[PDB]
């Protein structure tokens, strides 16, 4: 049994990371301007 509040907070951060990875890619990848 894994406490729900932990499941969300871990999956929560997990979402902020990957989406934040996307925002970084806006200044580096092909989606850049440099």
């Amino acid at each position: 049994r894994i406490p729900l509040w932990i499941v969300a907070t871990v999956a929560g951060m997990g979402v902020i990371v990957i989406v934040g990875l996307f925002f970084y890619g806006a200044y580096a990848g092909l989606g850049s301007s440099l």
Binding site: P3, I6, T9, M13
Partner: peptide, 28 residues
């Protein structure tokens, strides 16, 4: 170069100071 090491610790710090409280059960 990679200060993501910082964020990581200070980030899990938040839920830690209440997780330890779920362990020591009290005052939530």
């Amino acid at each position: 170069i990679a200060q993501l090491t910082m964020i990581a610790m200070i980030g899990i710090a938040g839920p830690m100071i209440i997780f330890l409280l779920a362990v020591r059960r009290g005052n939530l």
